[PDB]
Amino acid sequence: FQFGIWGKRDVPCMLNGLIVGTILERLEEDQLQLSTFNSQRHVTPFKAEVENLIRTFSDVNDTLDMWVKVQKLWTSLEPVFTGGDIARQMPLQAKQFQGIDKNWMKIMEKAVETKKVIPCCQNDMLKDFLPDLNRKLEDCQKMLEAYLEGKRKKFPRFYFVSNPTLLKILSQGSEPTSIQEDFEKLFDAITKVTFESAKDKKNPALKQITQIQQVIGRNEENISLTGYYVKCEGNIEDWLKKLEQNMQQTLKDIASAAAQQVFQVGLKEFVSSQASQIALLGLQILWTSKVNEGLERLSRNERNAMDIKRNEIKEHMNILSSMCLEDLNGAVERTKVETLVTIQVHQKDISMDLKCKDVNDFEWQKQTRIAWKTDIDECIISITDWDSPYSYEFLGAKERLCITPLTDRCYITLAQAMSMYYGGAPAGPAGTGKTETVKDLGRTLGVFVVVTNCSDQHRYRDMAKIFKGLVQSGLWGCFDEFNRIDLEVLSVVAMQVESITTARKQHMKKFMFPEEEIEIELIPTVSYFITMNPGYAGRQELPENLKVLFRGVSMMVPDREIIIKVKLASVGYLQIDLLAKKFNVLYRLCEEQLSKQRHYDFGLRNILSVLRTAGNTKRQEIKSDEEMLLMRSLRDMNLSKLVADDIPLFNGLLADIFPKLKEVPKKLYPDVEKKIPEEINAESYLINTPSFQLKIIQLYETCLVRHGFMLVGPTGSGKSTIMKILTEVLTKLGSPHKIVIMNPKAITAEQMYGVKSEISDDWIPGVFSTIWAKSNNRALKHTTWITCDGPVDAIWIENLNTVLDDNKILTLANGERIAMTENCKVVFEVENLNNASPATVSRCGQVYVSPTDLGYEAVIEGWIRNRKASGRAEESDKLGNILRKYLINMRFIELQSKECKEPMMDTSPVISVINILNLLTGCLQYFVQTQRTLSEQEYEKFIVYSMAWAIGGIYEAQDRVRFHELLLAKNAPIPQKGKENETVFDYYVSQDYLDWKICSPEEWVPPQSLQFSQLLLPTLDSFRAEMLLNFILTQPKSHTCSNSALLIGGSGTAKTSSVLLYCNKFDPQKMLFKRTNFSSATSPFMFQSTIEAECDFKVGKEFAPPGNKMMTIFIDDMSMPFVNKWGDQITLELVRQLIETGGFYMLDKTQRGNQRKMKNLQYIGAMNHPGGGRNDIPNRLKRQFFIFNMILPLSIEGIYGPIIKHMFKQKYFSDSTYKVIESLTSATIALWNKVKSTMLPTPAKFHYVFNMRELSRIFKGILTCKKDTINDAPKSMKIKPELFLVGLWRHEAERVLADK
């Protein structure tokens, strides 16, 4: 119990736990240990103790969480109401805050009295107060926005910051501590600043800034001194403004010096001495001045001096290239050098062919020249005509890019557009260098750029906030993906941007902004950019008011050869020009003449990934020939994505370009490859195979290189297992690893990223963003991998372009921007892309699992390994001695060997194998229970029985008899004792002895006469259904068993009948039940609601005494929910996350990143013969449910017999009418057959649909008049007693059939 107190500056003290990470984490594995113990068999005593313990632990957590959150709210609002004026100006909530201060102090003093946080949490009064206080503090913030707007006005950059984080920024309460974690999202590149206390007389020593630091990685950094200092004060805006100014001034003066030092000292000294930005400026200014001097010297007369200057540049090249590239210390220092090298390469390339006679010549007036004017001490950068001064922003070493001619076209275009006061809006396909070209023109001109990410959930207020910040500050904006935005928002944005354009045109210092009453100033060097993306799904047009402003730049085909060759120069290679052609031709040929698959990509993102890989390999000691290293790099990079067939074509293509080289081994990493089999053996049910080695190692490499990745591949292929085992091996050698899961189309995107509330005018938090904020904190030890898991629909994914691009910054419609760290990775366990534009295919790496990587046979061997765990007497060997040959050499001779051309549920056969295994375990469970071991022959019979169904469950009687004949021809014995035109399915194997018999027990009814009271009878179909169901439903949650079932049958084929017959047999004293039905417009929120109401408790946190009994969830028809237009329905996914993992994310407007847990449930479903007009369920979900047919009975003469018997035995006056009555029971059926066959539905008579319901309705009408029918005596209108009866039959049949 060590806590950190804010301060003693009043009577009370307010405190927080800065060790609470240890508390939370050690708690997590505590409860893991406790559940681990309890689940094991030998843990009889602890239940009385342990549960109480866990309960307290669980409970204390959420109380603590609520408390600390409220503290943060209060810890934002204290400095607000210390100031006199604002407290006066709004007395009401100021006194409300006096009240909360009283209550809060009382809570704190109670906690102080306790001395121990656990009794402190145990108090019950606390819990009522905390959330009401939370809501009131939200109201207080909703008062304070009116002052926030003014405070934002007083300093520009706060427009690029959200509300509550702005409050936290403003509640410093300290010079160093509070802002030391926020410099990143308030400047460009600064992260750390020293603080030196100067002790003024009688005042406490004031901390003042003296130098600034840019940290990248862990230890590598760049430091910048300051002569002019910056001192903290009482007003935060003041010392922030001074920081900005004094930075600008010292940058200017250091540059003013450095421009003399460049030509005085000589190349190496000032490049080594200065920082990166100043060094690059120095190189450019040297070259332009010397080239100028050469050109005039040519103008005077024919001279070599121009050639001497060009030769001087050529000489500089060798000295820079020889030493500083191969050997060097540190990452930042490394990046600096090749940033110089690329520029110098392009420099000499231009200077070679630079045949211009004088400065006025266009060839000289085409590049980005520079001049640091002395007479008026100032920088000035120059283009064809345009000119502008350097903006003096400290950026340190940034990885600026190569200069193809297309970039020159952009530079000239954008300079012209800015000279005419517009904003460039480049366009093209994905991945051609738009955003990065914009950012580089920003970087070279010395300005700071602010990328955002528009999306459909935007509103014009935030765009106004942005644009106000842009005009006030002097910065540049690049609204990436500007098109995917609402139409009317663009309509009003047209006005805003036109106003600012006209304002800037006049050169007016002060101007008026629409919608915003206060007058606001301007600084000239601003600009606007939108990198829109022409033509996809979910993409609107710009109304013609807005096309006026922006000038177009068509970026369709980037160059690909020059960039490669100059990058290879930058690393320092020697075989440049040949290799460049090799790269280009190989990637081209691969693009065109290879097979067409959606997920393939060979664009510039892949190429740059290969280059940034290839740096290290040359940096290694080997002096081997470059082309070998390069073949290895390219091949080993591009192997992962390719499907089975394309691999031979790919490396046959490789051979045609590098015929000199024969083969090279793949560089194999020894630690991981030795480590993998260790844990594969550590588990029970894991078989190692070479394909797993290959795929898991490939996953390791793509993890090592790129941000995020995808595991594309079909169902049942082992993706999740691969991820789990990889995380295990990484954790084994230190460097832990944690994994989170999510399902994107089982929650609405508005909830995923959060929106502004549509009732109370106030923001709500977003789930995925909450996980992001919780994950990317530094000072942690995990390495989190956020897993999305579902389909890839463009609408929700595509607004993560910034996070998956090189920006690696998240951006919201809130106005909130969160910076990525290397602690975090993003992964997708998606089946396959079918609704993805290349803008998302090319952003992330990928790995393809294939169906044959893990055959079903390997899964069988894993189950076998489990059988030799405990029941290891001989069973594994004996069972299998039939299984192996009986399964390998049989299953594929059923799909289409014999016709079998109506498999109502198309499937991949691995699901059938999982099914038969799960059935067989339940089959042998009884003899597992009694500890009895059987002979081989009985086991063979059992396997025949098991797999008869579960491959025979998806076929009709004709296909079933052909199946049966196959089994007769080439399989172990089926019943042969009678087999009197009865299939193998008809009989079952008995536990007591090796026999094939079947029957349905006799049972009549209770005395009640309601048709419901005549509920249902003991049929054969129902009994066999219970027989199959009960086996699976008894199995206790084995791996590959979800304990979930599913029937298939026509509309009106005894679905709810048999299910309800089962359900009545439950024992409500330890086994409950629940009903639900489905329609088209049932949404995930509805299913969420019904399941939450079903459990009524969070049984994860040691709760639910009444749900401790076992419950079942029954659903009639999983098909009917509305399939989305793409083909991916959005309701079943919540079910699939419920079955697969249990639980889901909450939506109660209070907390987001957390999930309820179901520790016990059961599941059952029923289908309607999918195909044609009937929908189908997602294929990913088919792996879990037991599926089999539900045929019509073919015995309906024998279902209704009894009810007529019980009606009959009342009068006893039917000397002959009994035989008649039975003939009615059969003649109704004859009529049913004839009418149902003869007259059909057509789309003009579509509802002409017949089933077995109408027979029940006919009888329900007949069954009336227990003795009133006898009373023919009043009428006797030529009526025998039977005549009235047949007339009743006639009228009944008419009214149930001759109406519709």
Ligand X SMILES: Nc1ncnc2c1ncn2[C@@H]1O[C@H](COP(=O)(O)OP(=O)(O)OP(=O)(O)O)[C@@H](O)[C@H]1O
- Looking at 147-155, 269-277, 683-691, 936-944, which segment touches ligand X (CB under 6 A)? 683-691
> Helix 604-619 and helix 576-593: axis angle, to 10°?
140
Indicate the burial class of 1032 (C-beta count within 10 angstroms; 0-12, 13-18, 19 or more): buried
Separation of alpha carbons 922 and 369, rounded Å: 81
Residue 832 in contact with ligand X, rule: CB under 6 A: no
Token duo for residue 1077: 């039905």
1149: alpha, beta or left, given left = phi > 0 and alpha = psi -120 to 50? left
Residues 449-468 that bind other proteins (CB under 8 A): 460
Partner whose binding site includes residue 1183, from ligand X, other proteins, ligand ADP, none (CB under 5 to 8 Å by kind): ligand X
Q: Which is nearer to other proteins, 1126 or 1208 (CB)?
A: 1126
For 784, the 3-state DSSP assignment is strand
Q: Cα-flanking dihedrals φ and ψ of residue 1002, to 5°?
A: -75, 135
Quick one: which segment of 142-150, 262-270, 724-732, 1013-1021 binds ligand ADP (CB under 6 A)? 1013-1021
Q: What's the min distance (Å) between Cβ of 128 and ligand X?
A: 43
Beta carbon of residue 554, minimum distance to other proteins (angstroms, whole number):
5
> Residue 578 or 1298: which CB sits closer to other proteins?
578
User: Dihedral angle at the C-alpha atoms of 150, 151, 156, 158, nearest 10 degrees?
Assistant: -120
Q: Least CB distance from residue 1300 to ligand ADP, whole Å?
A: 18
Kindly report the three-state secondary structure assignment for every residue of 348-385: HHHHHHCCCCCCCCCCCCCCCEEEEECCCCEEEEECCC
CB 437 to ligand ADP: min, Å: 7
Q: Does 494 bind other proteins (CB under 8 A)?
A: yes
Task: Tell me which residue has tokens 């313990």.
Answer: 53
Picked from ligand X, ligand ADP, other proteins, none, the partner binding residue 494 (CB below 5 to 8 A depending on kind) is other proteins
Give the torsion sign (CA, 796, 802, 806, 808).
negative
608 binds, among ligand X, other proteins, ligand ADP, none (CB under 5 to 8 A by kind): ligand ADP
Considering beta carbons, is residue 676 or 882 the nearer one to ligand X?
676
Helices 1055-1064, 1020-1034: inter-axial angle, 10-degree rounding: 60
User: What's the Cα-to-Cα distance from 894 to each of 520, 964, 1147, rounded to whole Å?
Assistant: 79, 11, 48
The number of beta carbons lying within 10 Å of the beta carbon of residue 155 is 17
Site membership for other proteins, residue 420 (CB under 8 A): yes
Q: State the minimum distance, in angstroms, from the CB of residue 583 to ligand ADP.
A: 14
* Residue 1078 in contact with ligand X, rule: CB under 6 A: no
DSSP SS3 for 788 = strand
**Which residues, including other chains, have CB under 8 Å from residue 964's CB and lie 6 or more apart?**
974, 983, 984, 985
* Residue 242 interacting partner from other proteins, ligand X, ligand ADP, none (CB closer than 5 to 8 Å by kind): none
CB 126 within 8 A of CB 108: no
Residues 501-540 as x/- pattern, contact with other proteins by CB under 8 A? --------------x---------------------x---
In the complex, the smallest distance separating the C-beta of residue 838 from other proteins, rounded to whole angstroms, is 10
CA distance 1081 to 1126: 17
Pick what 981 binds: ligand ADP, other proteins, ligand X, none; C-beta below 5 to 8 Å, kind-dependent. none
Q: Is 1017 in the site for ligand ADP (CB under 6 A)?
A: yes
Count of residues that interact with other proteins, criterion CB under 8 A: 56
By CB under 6 A, tell whether 859 contacts ligand X. yes
For residue 374, the minimal CB distance to other proteins (Å) is 24
Buried b (16+ CB within 10 A) or exposed e, 253-274: ebbeebbeebeeeebeebbeeb
Residue of 116, 135, 154, 1039 interacting with ligand X (CB under 6 A): 1039
- Residue corresponding to tokens 């991945």: 431
Give the one entry of ligand ADP, ligand X, other proteins, none that residue 720 binds, where binding means its C-beta sits below a cut-off of 5 to 8 angstroms depending on kind: ligand X
Is 661 a residue that touches ligand X (CB under 6 A)?
no
> Does residue 687 touch ligand X according to CB under 6 A?
yes
434 binds, among other proteins, ligand X, ligand ADP, none (CB under 5 to 8 A by kind): ligand ADP
63 binds ligand X, rule: CB under 6 A: no
C-alpha span between 1003 and 565 (Å, rounded): 87
Tell me the DSSP string of 872-930.
Answer: -SSHHHHHHHHHHHHHHTTTHHHHSSS-----SS---THHHHHHHHHHHHHHHHHHHHT
Closer by beta carbon to ligand X, 341 or else 951:
951
- The nearer residue to ligand X, 428 or 716, going by C-beta atoms, is 716
The bridge status of strand 530-531 relative to strand 1113-1115 is unpaired
- Count of CB atoms situated within 10 Å of the CB of 701: 19
Partner interacting with residue 416 (select from other proteins, ligand ADP, ligand X, none; CB below 5-8 Å by kind) = other proteins
**Residue number with the smallest Cβ distance to ligand ADP:** 433
3-state secondary structure of 449: strand
| Positions 21 through 80 that interact with ligand ADP (CB under 6 A) | none
Residue type for position 43: V
Q: Which residue, 671, 691, 689, is CA-closest to 680?
A: 689
Q: Which does 1252 bind (CB under 5 to 8 A by kind): ligand X, ligand ADP, other proteins, none?
A: ligand ADP
- Give the tokens for residue 197: 């206390």
Distance (Å) of CA 871 to CA 100, 612, 967, 1221: 65, 54, 30, 59
Residues 597-636 contacting ligand ADP, CB under 6 A: 604-605, 608
Per CB under 8 A, does 937 bind other proteins?
no
Site track 699-728 with ligand X (rule: CB under 6 A), x = hit:
----------------xxxxxxx-------
Other Cβ atoms closer than 10 A to 204: 9
Of residues 409-448, those binding ligand ADP (CB under 6 A):
430-436
1138: contact with ligand ADP by CB under 6 A: no
Contact with other proteins (CB under 8 A): which of 413, 640, 908, 1000?
413
- The DSSP string of 948-1006 is HTTTGGG--HHHHHHHHHHHHHHSS----S--SS--GGG-EE-SSSS-EE---------
Tokens of 1247: 């509802």
Neighbours of 76 (CB within 10 A): 21
Distance (Å, rounded) from C-alpha 658 to C-alpha 635?
Answer: 12
Cβ-based neighbour number of residue 1018 at 10 Å: 15
Q: How far is the CB of 377 from other proteins (least distance, A)?
A: 26
Residue 685 contact among ligand X, other proteins, ligand ADP, none, beta carbon within 5 to 8 Å by kind: ligand X
**Is residue 404 at the binding interface for ligand ADP, with CB under 6 A as the rule?**
yes
Is residue 686 close enough to count as binding ligand X by CB under 6 A? yes
- 353 interacts with, out of ligand X, other proteins, ligand ADP, none, CB within 5 to 8 A per kind: none
- The answer to the question of residue 1040 lying near ligand X (CB under 6 A) is yes
Composition of the chain by helix, strand, coil, percent to 5: 50, 10, 40
Stretch touching other proteins by CB under 8 A, among 85-93, 306-314, 650-658, 861-869: 650-658
Q: Which residues bind ligand ADP (CB under 6 A)?
A: 401-402, 404, 407, 430-436, 531, 558, 563, 604-605, 608, 805-806, 839, 1016-1017, 1019, 1022, 1049, 1051-1057, 1199, 1252-1253, 1256
Q: Which residues bind other proteins (CB under 8 A)?
A: 362, 385, 409, 412-413, 416, 420, 460, 487-489, 491-492, 494-495, 515, 537, 543-545, 547-548, 551-554, 556-557, 581-582, 585, 589, 592-593, 595-596, 648-649, 652, 656-657, 659, 834-835, 837, 1125-1127, 1172-1174, 1240-1243, 1246
Q: Which residues bind ligand X (CB under 6 A)?
A: 685-687, 715-721, 854, 858-859, 862, 1039-1040, 1180, 1183
